[PDB]
Amino acid sequence: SGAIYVGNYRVVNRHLATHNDWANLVWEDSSRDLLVSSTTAQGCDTIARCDCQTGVYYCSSRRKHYPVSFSKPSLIFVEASEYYPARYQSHLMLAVGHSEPGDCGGILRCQHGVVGIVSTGGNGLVGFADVRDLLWLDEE
Numbered sequence: 446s447g448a449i450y451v452g453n454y455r456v457v458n459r460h461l462a463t464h465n466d467w468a469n470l471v472w473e474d475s476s477r478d479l480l481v482s483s484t485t486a487q488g489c490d491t492i493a494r495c496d497c498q499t500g501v502y503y504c505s506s507r508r509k510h511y512p513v514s515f516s517k518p519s520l521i522f523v524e525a526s527e528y529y530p531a532r533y534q535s536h537l538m539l540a541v542g543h544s545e546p547g548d549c550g551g552i553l554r555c556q557h558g559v560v561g562i563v564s565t566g567g568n569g570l571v572g573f574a575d576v577r578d579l580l581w582l583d584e585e
């Protein structure tokens with residue numbers, strides 16, 4: 446689990462969105478595994494606006510933050526799960542790192558701010574849904 450709290454937005458994995466998220470919906474995209482809802486309180490995270498390919502992510506199944514090198518956002522085939530059929534997910538970045546299904550939502554960050562959240566993994570890989578292109582997260 447986990448979310449990004451930037452301005453009056455809450456960014457979560459679409460597959461982990463709550464009823465309150467759907468009832469306060471701003472934007473969702475199943476091909477990216479992302480959903481954004483509105484919040485009453487202002488958040489403290491800032492979004493990275495950069496070209497970094499190195500950063501650090503939070504892994505809940507280890508209670509640890511790990512440094513990683515990750516690929517540029519791309520269209521990648523993701524195997525069938527209990528949340529989606531086997532399909533292509535867009536804006537996904539891969540790295541070598543430990544992950545388990547409940548690690549989704551952990552933040553990936555670089556020196557400029559939040560880059561994305563854990564969205565996929567398996568066999569020593571971890572995938573992150575990029576948010577750096579969502580410029581509207583920085584405005585009301």
Ligand SMILES: COc1ccccc1CC(=O)N1CCN[C@H](C(N)=O)C1
Pocket residue numbers: 460478523526527528529534544545546547548549563564565566567568
């Ligand atoms: C961190 O996720 C894992 C890690 C290790 C093994 C398996 C996973 C789960 C994973 O890859 N899923 C299931 C949830 N939906 C994802 C999606 N974005 O389509 C894909």
Ligand SMILES: [Zn+2]
Pocket residue numbers: 493494495496497555556557558
């Ligand atoms: Zn950066």
